[PDB]
Amino acid sequence: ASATRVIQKLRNWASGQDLQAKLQLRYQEIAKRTQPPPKLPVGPSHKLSNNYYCTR
Amino acid sequence: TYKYVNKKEQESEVDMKSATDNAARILMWTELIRGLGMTLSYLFREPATINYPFEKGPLSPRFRGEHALRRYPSGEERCIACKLCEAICPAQAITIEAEPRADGSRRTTRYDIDMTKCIYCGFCQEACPVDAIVEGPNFEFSTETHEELLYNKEKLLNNGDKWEAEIAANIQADYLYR
Amino acid sequence: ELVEVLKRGVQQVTGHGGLRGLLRVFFRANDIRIGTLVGEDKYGNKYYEDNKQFFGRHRWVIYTTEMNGKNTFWDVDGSMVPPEWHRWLHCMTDDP
Amino acid sequence: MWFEILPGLAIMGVCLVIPGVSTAYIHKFTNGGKEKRVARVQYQWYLMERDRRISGVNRYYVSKGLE
Amino acid sequence: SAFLKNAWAKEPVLVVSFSVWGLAIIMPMISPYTKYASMINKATPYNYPVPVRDDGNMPDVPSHPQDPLGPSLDWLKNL
Amino acid sequence: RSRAEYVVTKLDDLINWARRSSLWPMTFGLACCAVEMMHMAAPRYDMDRFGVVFRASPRQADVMIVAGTLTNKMAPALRKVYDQMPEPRYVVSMGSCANGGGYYHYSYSVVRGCDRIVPVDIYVPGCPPTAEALLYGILQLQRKIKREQKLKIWYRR
Amino acid sequence: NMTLNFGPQHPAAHGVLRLVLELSGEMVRKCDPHIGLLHRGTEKLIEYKTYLQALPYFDRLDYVSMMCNEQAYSIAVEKLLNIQPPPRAQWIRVLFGEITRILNHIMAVTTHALDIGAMTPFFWMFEEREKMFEFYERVSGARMHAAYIRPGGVHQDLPLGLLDDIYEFSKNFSLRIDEVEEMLTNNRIWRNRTVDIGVVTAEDALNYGFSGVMLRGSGIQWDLRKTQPYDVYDQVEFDVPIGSRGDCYDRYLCRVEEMRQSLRIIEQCLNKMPPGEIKVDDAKVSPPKRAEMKTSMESLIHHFKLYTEGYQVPPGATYTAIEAPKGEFGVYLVSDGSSRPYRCKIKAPGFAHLAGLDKMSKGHMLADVVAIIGTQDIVFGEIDR
Amino acid sequence: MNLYTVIFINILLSLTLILVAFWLPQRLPFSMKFFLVAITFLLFDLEIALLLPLPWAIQTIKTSTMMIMAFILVTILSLGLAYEWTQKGLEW
Amino acid sequence: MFFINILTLLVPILIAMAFLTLVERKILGYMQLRKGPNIVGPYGILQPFADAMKLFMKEPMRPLTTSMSLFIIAPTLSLTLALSLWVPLPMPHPLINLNLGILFILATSSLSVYSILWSGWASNSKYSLFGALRAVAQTISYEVTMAIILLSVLLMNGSYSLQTLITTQEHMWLLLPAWPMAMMWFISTLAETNRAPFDLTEGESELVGFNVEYAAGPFALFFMAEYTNIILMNALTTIIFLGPLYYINLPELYSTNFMMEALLLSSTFLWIRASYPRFRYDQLMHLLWKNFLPLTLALCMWHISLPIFTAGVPPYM
Ligand SMILES: COC1=C(OC)C(=O)C(CC=C(C)C)=C(C)C1=O
Ligand code: SF4
Ligand code: SF4
């Protein structure tokens, strides 16, 4: 991006595609770092009852 | 569900118009010119390369990088020589021998990670109960001599002290996940 | 149009101090780009960020002139960056 | 950005015009401000030589109606 | 004819190749200018035209180049 | 400055700069480390920028990067290619498979390091040594090539 | 016949290949490929290593399709333990499995062109490949050689930003395939170099055990992903790109289609990934969570034993095949009751394909052989093992 | 002479390079196809010769004979080519 | 003064040779989403000089089995012929104008095929001999159409002297007429400089042949030769078919436009290289003998007929 319109137009044409819509270089669209803290889910078998291993 | 690639559904019988279009394709290299347009197009796109020393390719917290041994905030090295980091190392890299320190505490007399043997799996990071051995962020530790790559407890503890601030931040970010 | 790009170019060139500064950057960092100093570590390295540029090149470090004695004017190596600021540079943490 | 390729092209170009301007002014200096006569066929060499004999030793010097 | 067609679309060089071979073998035969080539080149005067003695028995030869007699290239002019 | 010593220091600085700026590497292409460099040759971390040739035949190669395990069947070859490289020549051992045996150290078919077969100048660590990490290693070769003082040694020899 | 060997250092030899060629003039009459230059002893080393500490080895057999390789060991060991991965983990393995087939195909299509002489397609896609590794590194910590897919379930949950970033990559990736699509699919020069080269007939392909895009390219309709659906390949919809004739072009076109079909599968996985746990909840098979091992005795005992000794999978033997990007990758794991395996025969799609080179490269020039190896997508790690 | 001056500088420049280059640092591959090509090449190379004077021959007063001759030469060689194609020649 | 002129033609051309290499390593780069060499010097300007010095310093290796003359004659011949062919070129004024100028360029090019033959025999290793034999064949084949394409041109120019075309192309480029051959001159110029679409002479994936045993100084000289040629042939396209505007009063606008057209067509073969895969050895000869030679021979006859029946026979001299 950050390309003068004319270069973009030349780009889009020479390529035959609207390459601007889907640029390869990433700009402020990528997930920000330090995404929020994760509280992951505990799966089955964590029941404190009727959880006999012999049955699983 | 299948899909035919390169299967001509039917025999389009040549029509002069069709023939001309084709003959022009062979005679005036029309498709070849199409290919040149694509490369000219990128010539105008911004290059994706990074100044390597000045800018660095992004690595998130789980990057394994270079081994380090951490210490408790008080200053007591975390490792208590349970030696299962040695047990689960796939490459036989970590060698640990221990004896009860004078304090009476359990500690490792010798902890040697052979980095040339290590394949940076990150299981040691996984296995440690006190999480004393961690995969530190640094990946730039290329060395002139083979011996430098072999690491004893003092290099790893020193590596741990140097990168402790970032190691602590990285473990802080990823521990909920683990 | 074209004038605009030339204009921003002037900004960049005139931005890194006088010609002395530009040459300092032009020849050792090989990039005349202006950003916002996000901080200066005790070693001397100066870190900058330009969120407008692509992910790969929004955060850069202009290393010091001398680190731990060694002259680092031209012999700049990555490890010069301090461990604290290493993760900021590698985008491990979005916080300076 | 592509403009960085220009510095190199410029140096090539400057180095491809020099030759054409150089050869075409080291001729107009050595031949007295008049393009070096191209003697494709003998007649021309004759006329050229004739010129030499007509004046000085060099053909570029050119005598006129006032002689 | 049908092959001709495919030939126009497959192996479309030879077709063009031969076509030209022929068109060059025809245009010369039929053209309003072909004759000029042998004239225009004939006329171009390369070797000095030596003058003949005047027995005085020749009314065809012009006694002077600019005379109204002799050959002319007005055909070359306004060609 | 004026001293036969100063002229001989400046001229190697010149000779060292030429070798440093243009290192044409030759990658054998063993195992997977070759991929982690095909990424260095690729656009995120161009190597050409630094003056590195993506593909160079042995006779025209300054640096050999041994990426991947050197089995006991490829050893006899590596040495040949190292031996046939032009004299000024340097080796960068990439991967715990090459600098040391890495996983596969104790195998009967793997040489425990290329250092056993070819003298090694920089050892780049990591199972897939990261591509910046190789780029740091290549840059470390450039720091080693700057320090060399061949002309100075001939003068005071 | 002027015997000439395609020596290892040559770039077209994938680093290790000594094709003893007999050149009847420039036409090559016989090839005797001498592999073995990268035999590391991968399957004799595994016998001495516990089931978890042998996972890493499977990321290095085919080194361009790491996770799909480690999904074959993970499925095998899981079968022998009669345990199944949790629902979220199975989607994550299918999500990472198709990122790997896009990654292998970008490897195979672009490096084939590098061999033929087209250099730009490699650079455009390789930037798209580091975008992808980042996804490996952000989920496992290793750009390649992750060790993420574990014998039971996967190792750690996806970071909280990965699925958005995989959408942004998949959203724009197809234009990138479209772009090399224009630059290397109709060029008369490519077609001439690739079309009608190394044709393999349908029955010959089955007899030579080709089992891959090489099987599908000649029109045989076989995908282990739809025929024998492993993991969740029963809940995702895709079209196998069967080619018609078998020339190296039809095989290229199939590889480009599978990249497109994988984007269709990746889309479904992001759209339908279930909330849940990433590893089976049996502490006997998958290691206990970090907080649990540090607060509950049953968990420390289970962590200590699993890391130090192992799963101790019940005695038996299984051959589990998954559709790795190259072709059918299968592990015949024979197991005694011990925590470490007894035998692990890695079937490599590639040992069969390289055998076919002599038959496929028949009546062909020195240059055709470079295309023939390129269209088998052979990585010598899998062949040499 | 002017050419001689230029050329000897040209050789000198190249010999200088190789000399510094060497001084500063201080069995049966045969396919008739290949031979056949070389031959064809000269048959064509000779023809190129019989065709080279055509720029001077254009100005020939005859013209008719010129073209009649030149067209016959080009056509008979091309037929030679034609038979080369028809025969296994040119089919490597 | 003549020497001054000799220097003005050779030195600049050689420097241009060097920077073409740099330009080839940046235009190919940006097309492939990469900056190319910018770190050595400012924007990579010092990059060509840097490897030149590295190449000359590295030890020239004389293979145990190698002639020592057919080995050192080969790069000297390659540089000598290529730099020599710049001697008689109209820009607009030629240093040494020769009445039979185009025959000089055709003959001098033809001699370079030997260097390939001599280097291949000298190396005494199989890769070299196989590469040389195919190479000589490519070069020679692309000479037969290359020559006929010029003969068609000359007949519409009237003479063999390259200086005449500046007067032939005072109203229109010879591309408009004769475009069909330009293309065929351009493709043949791509073959004779062993550039990409036709780089089988030295295929890398195929026989990593010409410089297999050539390193350091010998590598450089051919090397230099190839690139100078790359320019020269492009420059011949920019005189014979794209005729730069000539004004007798100011001779440099001829050279200014010669500069512009030569750089763009030199840029084009750089652009061709990145854009196309390399053709097969027989696919290459299949093109010339089957696709182009019949087109050229027939269009050759059309160019002996166009003059006569269009009463346009060109003026000699
Ligand atoms: C993609 O397949 C392969 C290549 O060819 C394109 C190789 O070049 C190589 C090695 C190549 C070099 C010289 C880096 C490997 C390992 C490979 O797997
Ligand atoms: S596991 Fe952690 S603590 Fe136990 S020994 Fe290895 S390092 Fe020290
Ligand atoms: S080191 Fe790690 S990555 Fe490099 S080869 Fe050996 S295993 Fe593969």
PDB file of C-alpha atoms and ligand atoms in Angstrom, chain F residues 27-32 34-35 37-38 54-55, chain G residues 9-15 63-64 107-108 111-112 114-115 378-380, ligand 1:
ATOM      1  CA  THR F  27      24.222 -25.038  -0.182  1.00  0.00           C
ATOM      2  CA  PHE F  28      24.545 -28.795  -0.377  1.00  0.00           C
ATOM      3  CA  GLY F  29      20.878 -29.081   0.523  1.00  0.00           C
ATOM      4  CA  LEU F  30      20.865 -31.937   3.029  1.00  0.00           C
ATOM      5  CA  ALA F  31      17.785 -32.614   5.250  1.00  0.00           C
ATOM      6  CA  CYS F  32      15.555 -29.634   6.133  1.00  0.00           C
ATOM      7  CA  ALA F  34      18.060 -26.108   3.386  1.00  0.00           C
ATOM      8  CA  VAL F  35      14.423 -25.052   3.577  1.00  0.00           C
ATOM      9  CA  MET F  37      17.545 -20.957   4.156  1.00  0.00           C
ATOM     10  CA  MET F  38      15.345 -21.131   1.030  1.00  0.00           C
ATOM     11  CA  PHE F  54      20.993 -17.775  -4.051  1.00  0.00           C
ATOM     12  CA  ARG F  55      22.611 -20.486  -6.171  1.00  0.00           C
TER      13      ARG F  55
ATOM     14  CA  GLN G   9      25.471 -30.782  -4.767  1.00  0.00           C
ATOM     15  CA  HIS G  10      23.592 -30.017  -8.033  1.00  0.00           C
ATOM     16  CA  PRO G  11      20.439 -27.948  -7.046  1.00  0.00           C
ATOM     17  CA  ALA G  12      17.991 -30.150  -9.048  1.00  0.00           C
ATOM     18  CA  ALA G  13      19.140 -33.184  -6.990  1.00  0.00           C
ATOM     19  CA  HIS G  14      17.281 -31.970  -3.818  1.00  0.00           C
ATOM     20  CA  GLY G  15      20.681 -31.891  -2.027  1.00  0.00           C
ATOM     21  CA  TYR G  63      10.442 -32.041   6.207  1.00  0.00           C
ATOM     22  CA  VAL G  64       8.046 -29.964   4.128  1.00  0.00           C
ATOM     23  CA  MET G 107       7.047 -26.049  -1.975  1.00  0.00           C
ATOM     24  CA  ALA G 108       6.423 -28.556  -4.788  1.00  0.00           C
ATOM     25  CA  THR G 111      10.725 -25.543  -6.560  1.00  0.00           C
ATOM     26  CA  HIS G 112       9.668 -27.534  -9.685  1.00  0.00           C
ATOM     27  CA  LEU G 114      13.002 -23.305  -9.919  1.00  0.00           C
ATOM     28  CA  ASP G 115      14.376 -26.503 -11.542  1.00  0.00           C
ATOM     29  CA  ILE G 378      10.101 -36.315  -3.530  1.00  0.00           C
ATOM     30  CA  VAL G 379      11.763 -35.125  -0.261  1.00  0.00           C
ATOM     31  CA  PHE G 380      14.654 -37.500   0.510  1.00  0.00           C
TER      32      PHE G 380
HETATM   33  C1  LIG J   1      11.715 -28.745  -2.651  1.00  0.00           C
HETATM   34  O1  LIG J   1      12.581 -29.854  -2.903  1.00  0.00           O
HETATM   35  C2  LIG J   1      13.915 -29.654  -2.704  1.00  0.00           C
HETATM   36  C3  LIG J   1      14.696 -28.825  -3.608  1.00  0.00           C
HETATM   37  O2  LIG J   1      14.487 -28.465  -4.907  1.00  0.00           O
HETATM   38  C4  LIG J   1      13.650 -27.347  -5.315  1.00  0.00           C
HETATM   39  C5  LIG J   1      16.001 -28.649  -3.224  1.00  0.00           C
HETATM   40  O3  LIG J   1      16.540 -27.776  -3.890  1.00  0.00           O
HETATM   41  C6  LIG J   1      16.537 -28.922  -1.924  1.00  0.00           C
HETATM   42  C7  LIG J   1      17.933 -28.466  -1.550  1.00  0.00           C
HETATM   43  C8  LIG J   1      18.372 -27.228  -2.282  1.00  0.00           C
HETATM   44  C9  LIG J   1      19.268 -26.326  -1.935  1.00  0.00           C
HETATM   45  C10 LIG J   1      20.576 -26.204  -2.646  1.00  0.00           C
HETATM   46  C11 LIG J   1      19.019 -25.309  -0.866  1.00  0.00           C
HETATM   47  C12 LIG J   1      15.749 -29.604  -1.029  1.00  0.00           C
HETATM   48  C13 LIG J   1      16.242 -30.036   0.314  1.00  0.00           C
HETATM   49  C14 LIG J   1      14.376 -29.938  -1.399  1.00  0.00           C
HETATM   50  O4  LIG J   1      13.628 -30.486  -0.604  1.00  0.00           O
END
